[PDB]
Amino acid sequence: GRLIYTAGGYFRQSLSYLEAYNPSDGTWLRLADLQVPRSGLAGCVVGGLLYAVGGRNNTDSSALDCYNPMTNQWSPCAPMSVPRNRIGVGVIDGHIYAVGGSHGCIHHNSVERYEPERDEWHLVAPMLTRRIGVGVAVLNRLLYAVGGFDGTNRLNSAECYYPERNEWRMITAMNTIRSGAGVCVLHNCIYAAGGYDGQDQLNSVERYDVETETWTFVAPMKHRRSALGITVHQGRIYVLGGYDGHTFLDSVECYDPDTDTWSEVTRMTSGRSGVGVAVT
Ligand SMILES: COc1ccc(S(=O)(=O)N(CC(N)=O)c2ccc(N(CC(N)=O)S(=O)(=O)c3ccc(N)cc3)c3ccccc23)cc1
């Protein structure tokens, strides 16, 4: 069946774990290690293939690597134009967008697009704001970049990229400042879960309604967490790991929108933060 993959991460040191969770029966699979251990990367899926993008070996990474579930093997891909630690990614029409992130002290506002069929990256219009630790979501064939840190200020702003027009517009700001939050899309809304507001790791969660242009708080998580992994599986949000301000979590919580409830449904084989997560 479809699995929740978690790639890389950090606990005491950069990790190369690739593990996958089966919500059906609660089991965990151990898969082929990443070639280079990394945290602060992003994960995504195009055409049934899993991609690990950017991050840092703790050296910032411009790397893109593709994992094939059917062969259990990692294959290097064309690198990005620049290293991107604390990157966000989204997928539109089988193309991977690499958003923001950092190279040393350089906070990127640039964005580039990867085409698997041709193993090529191309720059598109840059964001209106530099964003590292940015959350990314794809909705109605638009790309949203949410929160982050612009090099001096932590951000509650969000903005939206129009692929056909190749341009960005700011949207309504979130209620809370969030860097390192989990951003995903569930039933036509953008969810921003956790992250760091400049003082604390957060357990609060807000969702954006694109038509009313409003961010509304929903039920908070049980654990405060920043740099959590996030994905959507069968109509539910799953968050994985993260840093709560003291410990590297192994908690995996699951949000059910029908009940507006969070519940802890499993734990990773070891606590970690800064993972890349995707489902296939
Ligand atoms: C003061 O405590 C904090 C305050 C704010 C944040 S943050 O979440 O907001 N943030 C910075 C930002 N501007 O977004 C981030 C920091 C570090 C990362 N990692 C390493 C990396 N690749 O850089 S890590 O996950 O592996 C890791 C986390 C915590 C510890 N202790 C060690 C390692 C992040 C990875 C992804 C997204 C955001 C990351 C975090 C801790």
PDB file of C-alpha atoms and ligand atoms in Angstrom:
ATOM      1  CA  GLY A   1       0.000   0.000   0.000  1.00  0.00           C
ATOM      2  CA  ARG A   2       0.954   3.672   0.207  1.00  0.00           C
ATOM      3  CA  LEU A   3       3.533   4.403   2.889  1.00  0.00           C
ATOM      4  CA  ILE A   4       4.743   7.440   4.793  1.00  0.00           C
ATOM      5  CA  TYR A   5       8.463   7.777   4.079  1.00  0.00           C
ATOM      6  CA  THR A   6      10.810   9.718   6.357  1.00  0.00           C
ATOM      7  CA  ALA A   7      14.272  10.527   5.009  1.00  0.00           C
ATOM      8  CA  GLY A   8      17.325  11.873   6.828  1.00  0.00           C
ATOM      9  CA  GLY A   9      16.964  14.111   9.847  1.00  0.00           C
ATOM     10  CA  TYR A  10      19.011  14.996  12.886  1.00  0.00           C
ATOM     11  CA  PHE A  11      19.646  13.595  16.341  1.00  0.00           C
ATOM     12  CA  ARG A  12      23.104  14.366  17.746  1.00  0.00           C
ATOM     13  CA  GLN A  13      24.244  14.265  14.093  1.00  0.00           C
ATOM     14  CA  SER A  14      22.947  14.249  10.540  1.00  0.00           C
ATOM     15  CA  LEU A  15      21.160  10.985   9.727  1.00  0.00           C
ATOM     16  CA  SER A  16      20.766   8.871   6.602  1.00  0.00           C
ATOM     17  CA  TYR A  17      17.778   6.798   7.710  1.00  0.00           C
ATOM     18  CA  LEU A  18      15.097   6.086   5.160  1.00  0.00           C
ATOM     19  CA  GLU A  19      12.166   4.461   6.949  1.00  0.00           C
ATOM     20  CA  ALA A  20       8.554   4.073   5.925  1.00  0.00           C
ATOM     21  CA  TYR A  21       5.435   3.719   8.036  1.00  0.00           C
ATOM     22  CA  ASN A  22       2.317   1.743   7.119  1.00  0.00           C
ATOM     23  CA  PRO A  23      -0.723   3.411   8.739  1.00  0.00           C
ATOM     24  CA  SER A  24      -2.756   0.334   7.784  1.00  0.00           C
ATOM     25  CA  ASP A  25      -1.003  -2.033  10.204  1.00  0.00           C
ATOM     26  CA  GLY A  26       1.355   0.169  12.234  1.00  0.00           C
ATOM     27  CA  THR A  27       4.578  -1.415  10.966  1.00  0.00           C
ATOM     28  CA  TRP A  28       7.873   0.285  10.142  1.00  0.00           C
ATOM     29  CA  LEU A  29      10.156  -0.698   7.256  1.00  0.00           C
ATOM     30  CA  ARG A  30      13.900   0.003   7.157  1.00  0.00           C
ATOM     31  CA  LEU A  31      14.984   0.986   3.618  1.00  0.00           C
ATOM     32  CA  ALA A  32      18.234   1.891   1.865  1.00  0.00           C
ATOM     33  CA  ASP A  33      20.194   4.604   3.682  1.00  0.00           C
ATOM     34  CA  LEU A  34      20.720   7.909   1.930  1.00  0.00           C
ATOM     35  CA  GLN A  35      24.169   8.176   0.344  1.00  0.00           C
ATOM     36  CA  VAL A  36      24.924  11.383   2.302  1.00  0.00           C
ATOM     37  CA  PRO A  37      23.381  11.938   5.775  1.00  0.00           C
ATOM     38  CA  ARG A  38      21.259  15.084   5.813  1.00  0.00           C
ATOM     39  CA  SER A  39      18.834  17.122   7.866  1.00  0.00           C
ATOM     40  CA  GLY A  40      16.788  20.168   6.940  1.00  0.00           C
ATOM     41  CA  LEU A  41      16.015  18.626   3.551  1.00  0.00           C
ATOM     42  CA  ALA A  42      12.594  18.128   1.961  1.00  0.00           C
ATOM     43  CA  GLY A  43      10.935  15.066   0.484  1.00  0.00           C
ATOM     44  CA  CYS A  44       8.434  14.712  -2.321  1.00  0.00           C
ATOM     45  CA  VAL A  45       7.040  12.180  -4.785  1.00  0.00           C
ATOM     46  CA  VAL A  46       6.688  12.411  -8.561  1.00  0.00           C
ATOM     47  CA  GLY A  47       5.499   9.415 -10.550  1.00  0.00           C
ATOM     48  CA  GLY A  48       5.884   6.995  -7.663  1.00  0.00           C
ATOM     49  CA  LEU A  49       9.523   8.019  -7.083  1.00  0.00           C
ATOM     50  CA  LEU A  50      10.717   9.589  -3.811  1.00  0.00           C
ATOM     51  CA  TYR A  51      13.010  12.646  -3.950  1.00  0.00           C
ATOM     52  CA  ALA A  52      15.290  14.052  -1.238  1.00  0.00           C
ATOM     53  CA  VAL A  53      16.147  17.711  -1.828  1.00  0.00           C
ATOM     54  CA  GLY A  54      18.708  20.037  -0.249  1.00  0.00           C
ATOM     55  CA  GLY A  55      19.409  20.252   3.454  1.00  0.00           C
ATOM     56  CA  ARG A  56      22.757  20.003   5.191  1.00  0.00           C
ATOM     57  CA  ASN A  57      25.419  17.466   6.135  1.00  0.00           C
ATOM     58  CA  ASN A  58      26.521  18.419   9.643  1.00  0.00           C
ATOM     59  CA  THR A  59      28.019  21.680   4.546  1.00  0.00           C
ATOM     60  CA  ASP A  60      24.823  22.921   2.913  1.00  0.00           C
ATOM     61  CA  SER A  61      23.457  20.694   0.151  1.00  0.00           C
ATOM     62  CA  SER A  62      22.438  21.470  -3.420  1.00  0.00           C
ATOM     63  CA  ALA A  63      21.807  17.768  -3.936  1.00  0.00           C
ATOM     64  CA  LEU A  64      18.771  16.009  -5.385  1.00  0.00           C
ATOM     65  CA  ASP A  65      18.538  12.230  -4.975  1.00  0.00           C
ATOM     66  CA  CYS A  66      15.812   9.889  -6.162  1.00  0.00           C
ATOM     67  CA  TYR A  67      14.724   6.741  -4.336  1.00  0.00           C
ATOM     68  CA  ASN A  68      12.869   4.007  -6.212  1.00  0.00           C
ATOM     69  CA  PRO A  69      10.642   1.884  -3.945  1.00  0.00           C
ATOM     70  CA  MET A  70      10.636  -0.958  -6.504  1.00  0.00           C
ATOM     71  CA  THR A  71      14.447  -1.244  -6.486  1.00  0.00           C
ATOM     72  CA  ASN A  72      15.151   0.075  -2.945  1.00  0.00           C
ATOM     73  CA  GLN A  73      17.966   2.146  -4.451  1.00  0.00           C
ATOM     74  CA  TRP A  74      18.988   5.820  -4.374  1.00  0.00           C
ATOM     75  CA  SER A  75      20.096   7.502  -7.605  1.00  0.00           C
ATOM     76  CA  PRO A  76      21.807  10.918  -7.810  1.00  0.00           C
ATOM     77  CA  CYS A  77      20.102  13.588  -9.913  1.00  0.00           C
ATOM     78  CA  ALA A  78      21.177  16.923 -11.351  1.00  0.00           C
ATOM     79  CA  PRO A  79      21.994  19.298  -8.441  1.00  0.00           C
ATOM     80  CA  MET A  80      20.241  22.581  -7.786  1.00  0.00           C
ATOM     81  CA  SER A  81      21.799  25.866  -8.838  1.00  0.00           C
ATOM     82  CA  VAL A  82      22.581  26.603  -5.122  1.00  0.00           C
ATOM     83  CA  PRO A  83      22.732  24.770  -1.803  1.00  0.00           C
ATOM     84  CA  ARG A  84      19.387  24.977   0.029  1.00  0.00           C
ATOM     85  CA  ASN A  85      19.296  24.091   3.714  1.00  0.00           C
ATOM     86  CA  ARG A  86      15.929  24.339   5.460  1.00  0.00           C
ATOM     87  CA  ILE A  87      14.280  24.133   2.063  1.00  0.00           C
ATOM     88  CA  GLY A  88      10.636  23.865   1.109  1.00  0.00           C
ATOM     89  CA  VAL A  89       9.387  21.956  -1.934  1.00  0.00           C
ATOM     90  CA  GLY A  90       6.130  21.373  -3.788  1.00  0.00           C
ATOM     91  CA  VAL A  91       5.076  19.491  -6.910  1.00  0.00           C
ATOM     92  CA  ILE A  92       3.047  20.943  -9.805  1.00  0.00           C
ATOM     93  CA  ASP A  93       2.400  18.888 -12.971  1.00  0.00           C
ATOM     94  CA  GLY A  94       5.229  16.491 -12.200  1.00  0.00           C
ATOM     95  CA  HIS A  95       7.730  19.310 -11.635  1.00  0.00           C
ATOM     96  CA  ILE A  96       9.512  19.831  -8.327  1.00  0.00           C
ATOM     97  CA  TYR A  97       9.758  23.380  -6.988  1.00  0.00           C
ATOM     98  CA  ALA A  98      12.666  24.057  -4.619  1.00  0.00           C
ATOM     99  CA  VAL A  99      11.826  27.115  -2.529  1.00  0.00           C
ATOM    100  CA  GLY A 100      14.055  29.353  -0.441  1.00  0.00           C
ATOM    101  CA  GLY A 101      16.386  27.868   2.143  1.00  0.00           C
ATOM    102  CA  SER A 102      19.922  28.965   2.901  1.00  0.00           C
ATOM    103  CA  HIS A 103      23.546  28.660   1.824  1.00  0.00           C
ATOM    104  CA  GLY A 104      25.734  29.611   4.750  1.00  0.00           C
ATOM    105  CA  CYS A 105      24.402  32.998   5.772  1.00  0.00           C
ATOM    106  CA  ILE A 106      22.739  33.626   2.411  1.00  0.00           C
ATOM    107  CA  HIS A 107      18.955  33.472   2.836  1.00  0.00           C
ATOM    108  CA  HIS A 108      17.479  32.570  -0.557  1.00  0.00           C
ATOM    109  CA  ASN A 109      14.452  34.184  -2.071  1.00  0.00           C
ATOM    110  CA  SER A 110      15.182  32.302  -5.302  1.00  0.00           C
ATOM    111  CA  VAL A 111      13.076  29.385  -6.553  1.00  0.00           C
ATOM    112  CA  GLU A 112      13.939  26.683  -9.078  1.00  0.00           C
ATOM    113  CA  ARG A 113      11.958  23.966 -10.842  1.00  0.00           C
ATOM    114  CA  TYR A 114      13.126  20.431 -11.605  1.00  0.00           C
ATOM    115  CA  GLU A 115      11.904  18.349 -14.535  1.00  0.00           C
ATOM    116  CA  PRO A 116      12.381  14.583 -13.944  1.00  0.00           C
ATOM    117  CA  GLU A 117      11.902  13.624 -17.618  1.00  0.00           C
ATOM    118  CA  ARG A 118      15.004  15.651 -18.509  1.00  0.00           C
ATOM    119  CA  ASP A 119      16.964  15.765 -15.222  1.00  0.00           C
ATOM    120  CA  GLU A 120      17.195  19.570 -15.392  1.00  0.00           C
ATOM    121  CA  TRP A 121      16.697  22.491 -12.984  1.00  0.00           C
ATOM    122  CA  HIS A 122      15.560  25.973 -14.041  1.00  0.00           C
ATOM    123  CA  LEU A 123      15.137  29.229 -12.122  1.00  0.00           C
ATOM    124  CA  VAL A 124      11.659  30.755 -12.006  1.00  0.00           C
ATOM    125  CA  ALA A 125      10.495  34.056 -10.534  1.00  0.00           C
ATOM    126  CA  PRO A 126      11.982  34.689  -7.068  1.00  0.00           C
ATOM    127  CA  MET A 127       9.804  35.090  -3.995  1.00  0.00           C
ATOM    128  CA  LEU A 128       8.902  38.502  -2.616  1.00  0.00           C
ATOM    129  CA  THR A 129      10.566  37.493   0.689  1.00  0.00           C
ATOM    130  CA  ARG A 130      13.698  35.552   1.593  1.00  0.00           C
ATOM    131  CA  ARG A 131      12.528  32.446   3.460  1.00  0.00           C
ATOM    132  CA  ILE A 132      14.479  29.699   5.191  1.00  0.00           C
ATOM    133  CA  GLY A 133      12.629  27.110   7.232  1.00  0.00           C
ATOM    134  CA  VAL A 134       9.714  27.830   4.872  1.00  0.00           C
ATOM    135  CA  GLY A 135       6.697  25.551   4.530  1.00  0.00           C
ATOM    136  CA  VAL A 136       5.376  24.816   1.046  1.00  0.00           C
ATOM    137  CA  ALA A 137       1.948  23.665  -0.142  1.00  0.00           C
ATOM    138  CA  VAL A 138       0.342  23.175  -3.555  1.00  0.00           C
ATOM    139  CA  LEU A 139      -3.335  23.966  -3.972  1.00  0.00           C
ATOM    140  CA  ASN A 140      -5.414  24.652  -7.117  1.00  0.00           C
ATOM    141  CA  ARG A 141      -2.176  24.455  -9.099  1.00  0.00           C
ATOM    142  CA  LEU A 142      -0.785  27.359  -7.091  1.00  0.00           C
ATOM    143  CA  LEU A 143       2.322  27.147  -4.891  1.00  0.00           C
ATOM    144  CA  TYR A 144       2.207  28.656  -1.378  1.00  0.00           C
ATOM    145  CA  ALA A 145       5.315  29.535   0.656  1.00  0.00           C
ATOM    146  CA  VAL A 146       4.459  29.996   4.344  1.00  0.00           C
ATOM    147  CA  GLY A 147       6.523  31.564   7.134  1.00  0.00           C
ATOM    148  CA  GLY A 148      10.222  31.033   7.646  1.00  0.00           C
ATOM    149  CA  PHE A 149      13.044  33.397   8.547  1.00  0.00           C
ATOM    150  CA  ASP A 150      14.241  36.074   6.141  1.00  0.00           C
ATOM    151  CA  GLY A 151      17.700  36.581   7.667  1.00  0.00           C
ATOM    152  CA  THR A 152      16.615  39.195  10.224  1.00  0.00           C
ATOM    153  CA  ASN A 153      12.925  38.657  11.033  1.00  0.00           C
ATOM    154  CA  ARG A 154      10.926  35.537  11.725  1.00  0.00           C
ATOM    155  CA  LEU A 155       7.872  35.539   9.496  1.00  0.00           C
ATOM    156  CA  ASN A 156       4.127  35.177   9.716  1.00  0.00           C
ATOM    157  CA  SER A 157       3.763  36.307   6.091  1.00  0.00           C
ATOM    158  CA  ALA A 158       2.861  33.938   3.265  1.00  0.00           C
ATOM    159  CA  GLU A 159       2.865  34.277  -0.501  1.00  0.00           C
ATOM    160  CA  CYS A 160       1.584  32.459  -3.531  1.00  0.00           C
ATOM    161  CA  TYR A 161       3.223  31.611  -6.854  1.00  0.00           C
ATOM    162  CA  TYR A 162       1.266  31.621 -10.132  1.00  0.00           C
ATOM    163  CA  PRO A 163       3.015  29.142 -12.466  1.00  0.00           C
ATOM    164  CA  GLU A 164       1.233  30.176 -15.682  1.00  0.00           C
ATOM    165  CA  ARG A 165       2.046  33.828 -14.956  1.00  0.00           C
ATOM    166  CA  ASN A 166       5.438  33.177 -13.279  1.00  0.00           C
ATOM    167  CA  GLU A 167       4.814  35.666 -10.482  1.00  0.00           C
ATOM    168  CA  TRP A 168       4.308  35.842  -6.701  1.00  0.00           C
ATOM    169  CA  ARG A 169       1.704  37.635  -4.591  1.00  0.00           C
ATOM    170  CA  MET A 170       1.556  38.052  -0.819  1.00  0.00           C
ATOM    171  CA  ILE A 171      -1.506  36.559   0.843  1.00  0.00           C
ATOM    172  CA  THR A 172      -2.998  37.044   4.304  1.00  0.00           C
ATOM    173  CA  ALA A 173      -0.449  36.751   7.108  1.00  0.00           C
ATOM    174  CA  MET A 174      -0.790  33.901   9.601  1.00  0.00           C
ATOM    175  CA  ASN A 175      -1.910  34.524  13.173  1.00  0.00           C
ATOM    176  CA  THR A 176       1.466  33.345  14.520  1.00  0.00           C
ATOM    177  CA  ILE A 177       5.077  33.790  13.442  1.00  0.00           C
ATOM    178  CA  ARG A 178       6.328  30.352  12.336  1.00  0.00           C
ATOM    179  CA  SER A 179       9.697  29.187  11.122  1.00  0.00           C
ATOM    180  CA  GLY A 180      10.235  25.455  10.731  1.00  0.00           C
ATOM    181  CA  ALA A 181       6.546  24.542  10.663  1.00  0.00           C
ATOM    182  CA  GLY A 182       4.883  21.681   8.817  1.00  0.00           C
ATOM    183  CA  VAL A 183       2.832  22.981   5.888  1.00  0.00           C
ATOM    184  CA  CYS A 184       0.480  20.722   3.941  1.00  0.00           C
ATOM    185  CA  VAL A 185      -2.877  20.757   2.171  1.00  0.00           C
ATOM    186  CA  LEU A 186      -5.952  18.883   3.415  1.00  0.00           C
ATOM    187  CA  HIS A 187      -9.476  19.136   1.960  1.00  0.00           C
ATOM    188  CA  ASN A 188      -8.864  22.431   0.152  1.00  0.00           C
ATOM    189  CA  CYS A 189      -7.180  24.274   3.068  1.00  0.00           C
ATOM    190  CA  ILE A 190      -3.539  25.083   3.836  1.00  0.00           C
ATOM    191  CA  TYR A 191      -2.440  23.866   7.262  1.00  0.00           C
ATOM    192  CA  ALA A 192       0.519  25.324   9.179  1.00  0.00           C
ATOM    193  CA  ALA A 193       1.380  23.145  12.183  1.00  0.00           C
ATOM    194  CA  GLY A 194       3.972  23.903  14.851  1.00  0.00           C
ATOM    195  CA  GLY A 195       7.219  25.687  14.144  1.00  0.00           C
ATOM    196  CA  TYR A 196       9.038  28.359  16.110  1.00  0.00           C
ATOM    197  CA  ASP A 197       7.796  31.882  16.794  1.00  0.00           C
ATOM    198  CA  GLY A 198      11.086  33.382  18.024  1.00  0.00           C
ATOM    199  CA  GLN A 199      10.526  32.429  21.665  1.00  0.00           C
ATOM    200  CA  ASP A 200       9.102  28.878  21.817  1.00  0.00           C
ATOM    201  CA  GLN A 201       8.389  25.807  19.778  1.00  0.00           C
ATOM    202  CA  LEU A 202       4.690  25.721  18.996  1.00  0.00           C
ATOM    203  CA  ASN A 203       1.896  23.192  19.274  1.00  0.00           C
ATOM    204  CA  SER A 204      -0.713  25.474  17.679  1.00  0.00           C
ATOM    205  CA  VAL A 205      -2.085  24.800  14.195  1.00  0.00           C
ATOM    206  CA  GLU A 206      -3.885  27.185  11.857  1.00  0.00           C
ATOM    207  CA  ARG A 207      -5.466  26.620   8.464  1.00  0.00           C
ATOM    208  CA  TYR A 208      -5.908  29.022   5.566  1.00  0.00           C
ATOM    209  CA  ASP A 209      -9.127  29.185   3.562  1.00  0.00           C
ATOM    210  CA  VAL A 210      -8.186  30.543   0.150  1.00  0.00           C
ATOM    211  CA  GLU A 211     -11.620  31.949  -0.631  1.00  0.00           C
ATOM    212  CA  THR A 212     -12.231  33.725   2.705  1.00  0.00           C
ATOM    213  CA  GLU A 213      -8.497  34.593   2.912  1.00  0.00           C
ATOM    214  CA  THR A 214      -8.580  33.830   6.654  1.00  0.00           C
ATOM    215  CA  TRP A 215      -6.233  31.865   8.898  1.00  0.00           C
ATOM    216  CA  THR A 216      -8.168  30.023  11.616  1.00  0.00           C
ATOM    217  CA  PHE A 217      -6.731  28.110  14.574  1.00  0.00           C
ATOM    218  CA  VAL A 218      -7.648  24.433  14.857  1.00  0.00           C
ATOM    219  CA  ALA A 219      -6.962  21.908  17.627  1.00  0.00           C
ATOM    220  CA  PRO A 220      -3.313  22.061  18.768  1.00  0.00           C
ATOM    221  CA  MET A 221      -0.910  19.137  18.738  1.00  0.00           C
ATOM    222  CA  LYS A 222       0.034  17.309  21.919  1.00  0.00           C
ATOM    223  CA  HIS A 223       3.756  18.051  21.402  1.00  0.00           C
ATOM    224  CA  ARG A 224       5.278  21.412  20.626  1.00  0.00           C
ATOM    225  CA  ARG A 225       7.555  20.944  17.648  1.00  0.00           C
ATOM    226  CA  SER A 226       9.644  22.777  15.073  1.00  0.00           C
ATOM    227  CA  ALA A 227      11.302  21.259  12.006  1.00  0.00           C
ATOM    228  CA  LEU A 228       8.683  18.506  12.067  1.00  0.00           C
ATOM    229  CA  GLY A 229       7.961  16.324   9.065  1.00  0.00           C
ATOM    230  CA  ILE A 230       4.421  16.440   7.709  1.00  0.00           C
ATOM    231  CA  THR A 231       2.295  14.738   5.087  1.00  0.00           C
ATOM    232  CA  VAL A 232      -1.309  13.842   4.310  1.00  0.00           C
ATOM    233  CA  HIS A 233      -2.509  10.245   4.142  1.00  0.00           C
ATOM    234  CA  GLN A 234      -6.118   9.158   3.544  1.00  0.00           C
ATOM    235  CA  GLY A 235      -7.628  12.440   4.614  1.00  0.00           C
ATOM    236  CA  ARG A 236      -5.537  12.809   7.778  1.00  0.00           C
ATOM    237  CA  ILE A 237      -2.476  14.903   8.636  1.00  0.00           C
ATOM    238  CA  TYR A 238       0.601  13.096   9.969  1.00  0.00           C
ATOM    239  CA  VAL A 239       3.468  14.960  11.647  1.00  0.00           C
ATOM    240  CA  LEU A 240       6.718  13.179  12.423  1.00  0.00           C
ATOM    241  CA  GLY A 241       9.454  14.063  14.881  1.00  0.00           C
ATOM    242  CA  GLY A 242      10.694  17.605  15.321  1.00  0.00           C
ATOM    243  CA  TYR A 243      12.361  19.486  18.151  1.00  0.00           C
ATOM    244  CA  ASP A 244      10.242  20.574  21.105  1.00  0.00           C
ATOM    245  CA  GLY A 245      12.847  22.903  22.613  1.00  0.00           C
ATOM    246  CA  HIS A 246      14.517  20.191  24.721  1.00  0.00           C
ATOM    247  CA  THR A 247      14.256  16.799  23.027  1.00  0.00           C
ATOM    248  CA  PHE A 248      14.241  15.284  19.552  1.00  0.00           C
ATOM    249  CA  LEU A 249      10.799  13.721  19.286  1.00  0.00           C
ATOM    250  CA  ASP A 250       9.886  10.281  17.992  1.00  0.00           C
ATOM    251  CA  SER A 251       6.190  11.075  18.349  1.00  0.00           C
ATOM    252  CA  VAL A 252       4.021  10.763  15.258  1.00  0.00           C
ATOM    253  CA  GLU A 253       0.652  12.486  15.677  1.00  0.00           C
ATOM    254  CA  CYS A 254      -2.316  12.227  13.359  1.00  0.00           C
ATOM    255  CA  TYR A 255      -4.939  14.932  12.873  1.00  0.00           C
ATOM    256  CA  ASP A 256      -8.492  13.985  11.902  1.00  0.00           C
ATOM    257  CA  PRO A 257     -10.364  16.996  10.474  1.00  0.00           C
ATOM    258  CA  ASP A 258     -13.792  15.416  10.961  1.00  0.00           C
ATOM    259  CA  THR A 259     -13.264  15.350  14.740  1.00  0.00           C
ATOM    260  CA  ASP A 260     -10.756  18.251  14.918  1.00  0.00           C
ATOM    261  CA  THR A 261      -8.655  15.867  17.026  1.00  0.00           C
ATOM    262  CA  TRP A 262      -4.983  14.967  17.253  1.00  0.00           C
ATOM    263  CA  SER A 263      -3.911  11.521  18.390  1.00  0.00           C
ATOM    264  CA  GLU A 264      -0.497   9.897  18.706  1.00  0.00           C
ATOM    265  CA  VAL A 265      -0.582   6.862  16.431  1.00  0.00           C
ATOM    266  CA  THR A 266       3.025   5.577  16.475  1.00  0.00           C
ATOM    267  CA  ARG A 267       6.609   6.523  17.235  1.00  0.00           C
ATOM    268  CA  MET A 268       9.604   6.506  14.943  1.00  0.00           C
ATOM    269  CA  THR A 269      12.349   4.010  15.694  1.00  0.00           C
ATOM    270  CA  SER A 270      14.345   6.921  17.170  1.00  0.00           C
ATOM    271  CA  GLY A 271      13.654  10.585  17.814  1.00  0.00           C
ATOM    272  CA  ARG A 272      14.744  13.066  15.140  1.00  0.00           C
ATOM    273  CA  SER A 273      13.945  16.423  13.591  1.00  0.00           C
ATOM    274  CA  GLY A 274      14.554  18.076  10.248  1.00  0.00           C
ATOM    275  CA  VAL A 275      13.414  15.090   8.162  1.00  0.00           C
ATOM    276  CA  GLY A 276      11.952  15.037   4.661  1.00  0.00           C
ATOM    277  CA  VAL A 277       8.591  13.292   4.398  1.00  0.00           C
ATOM    278  CA  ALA A 278       6.328  12.166   1.542  1.00  0.00           C
ATOM    279  CA  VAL A 279       3.839   9.420   0.713  1.00  0.00           C
ATOM    280  CA  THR A 280       3.713   6.859  -2.062  1.00  0.00           C
TER     281      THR A 280
HETATM  282  C1  LIG B   1      16.585  27.542  19.269  1.00  0.00           C
HETATM  283  O1  LIG B   1      16.008  26.317  18.900  1.00  0.00           O
HETATM  284  C2  LIG B   1      15.443  26.322  17.620  1.00  0.00           C
HETATM  285  C3  LIG B   1      14.775  27.450  17.159  1.00  0.00           C
HETATM  286  C4  LIG B   1      14.217  27.467  15.894  1.00  0.00           C
HETATM  287  C5  LIG B   1      14.317  26.342  15.091  1.00  0.00           C
HETATM  288  S1  LIG B   1      13.600  26.321  13.428  1.00  0.00           S
HETATM  289  O2  LIG B   1      12.809  25.102  13.353  1.00  0.00           O
HETATM  290  O3  LIG B   1      12.622  27.391  13.255  1.00  0.00           O
HETATM  291  N1  LIG B   1      14.938  26.404  12.343  1.00  0.00           N
HETATM  292  C6  LIG B   1      15.526  27.631  11.860  1.00  0.00           C
HETATM  293  C7  LIG B   1      14.657  28.456  10.930  1.00  0.00           C
HETATM  294  N2  LIG B   1      15.025  29.847  10.767  1.00  0.00           N
HETATM  295  O4  LIG B   1      13.726  27.979  10.356  1.00  0.00           O
HETATM  296  C8  LIG B   1      15.640  25.178  12.047  1.00  0.00           C
HETATM  297  C9  LIG B   1      16.782  24.953  12.788  1.00  0.00           C
HETATM  298  C10 LIG B   1      17.531  23.812  12.615  1.00  0.00           C
HETATM  299  C11 LIG B   1      17.167  22.857  11.697  1.00  0.00           C
HETATM  300  N3  LIG B   1      18.036  21.685  11.683  1.00  0.00           N
HETATM  301  C12 LIG B   1      19.374  21.606  11.151  1.00  0.00           C
HETATM  302  C13 LIG B   1      19.630  22.233   9.798  1.00  0.00           C
HETATM  303  N4  LIG B   1      19.666  21.371   8.634  1.00  0.00           N
HETATM  304  O5  LIG B   1      19.854  23.395   9.720  1.00  0.00           O
HETATM  305  S2  LIG B   1      17.526  20.320  12.586  1.00  0.00           S
HETATM  306  O6  LIG B   1      16.112  19.982  12.450  1.00  0.00           O
HETATM  307  O7  LIG B   1      18.207  19.104  12.147  1.00  0.00           O
HETATM  308  C14 LIG B   1      17.861  20.741  14.332  1.00  0.00           C
HETATM  309  C15 LIG B   1      16.877  21.353  15.096  1.00  0.00           C
HETATM  310  C16 LIG B   1      17.135  21.690  16.422  1.00  0.00           C
HETATM  311  C17 LIG B   1      18.373  21.422  16.967  1.00  0.00           C
HETATM  312  N5  LIG B   1      18.659  21.756  18.344  1.00  0.00           N
HETATM  313  C18 LIG B   1      19.355  20.818  16.200  1.00  0.00           C
HETATM  314  C19 LIG B   1      19.102  20.481  14.885  1.00  0.00           C
HETATM  315  C20 LIG B   1      15.993  23.081  10.970  1.00  0.00           C
HETATM  316  C21 LIG B   1      15.618  22.117  10.058  1.00  0.00           C
HETATM  317  C22 LIG B   1      14.464  22.330   9.317  1.00  0.00           C
HETATM  318  C23 LIG B   1      13.705  23.489   9.485  1.00  0.00           C
HETATM  319  C24 LIG B   1      14.092  24.455  10.401  1.00  0.00           C
HETATM  320  C25 LIG B   1      15.244  24.231  11.131  1.00  0.00           C
HETATM  321  C26 LIG B   1      14.976  25.212  15.546  1.00  0.00           C
HETATM  322  C27 LIG B   1      15.536  25.198  16.812  1.00  0.00           C
END
